[PDB]
Design a protein around this ligand. Structure first.
Ligand SMILES: CCOC(=O)c1cn(C)c(=O)cc1Cl
Length: 116
């Protein structure tokens, strides 16, 4: 609270570490359904069903233009990608399973990197 300072973790490396993690996401072989925004003109249902679309290229742009205040807002957008995927796709589908694989892949890197 006011004039009661709390110990803060060092966040000076966060931008660089998130960029590194995002690069590893982008180059994963199962990253293909998530590299670009879903085409709202070709994909039936998506625009009405998915209230907040998100993809790796949009995250990359936001990260490169200072639109993430902190690393937690970065993680929210990444998880948003796989939450949207689960909403729209069957688990038994190629995109559905790709989503599950990428989520697991992200979370281990998140823990290994920041859960010091
Ligand atoms: C490159 C193929 O991507 C898609 O068209 C697509 C991706 N996701 C993550 C979806 O949920 C639905 C589609 Cl149609």
């Amino acid at each position: 609270s006011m004039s009661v300072k709390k110990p803060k973790r060092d966040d000076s490396k966060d931008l660089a570490l998130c960029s590194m993690i995002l690069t590893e996401m982008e180059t994963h072989e199962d990253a293909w359904p998530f590299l670009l925004p879903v085409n709202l003109k070709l994909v039936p249902g998506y625009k009405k069903v998915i209230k907040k679309p998100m993809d790796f290229s949009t995250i990359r742009e936001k990260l490169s233009s200072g639109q993430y205040p902190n690393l937690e807002t970065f993680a929210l957008d990444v998880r948003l990608v796989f939450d949207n995927c689960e909403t729209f796709n069957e688990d038994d589908s190629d995109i559905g399973r790709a989503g599950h694989n990428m989520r697991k892949y992200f979370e281990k890197k998140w823990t290994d990197t920041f859960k010091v």
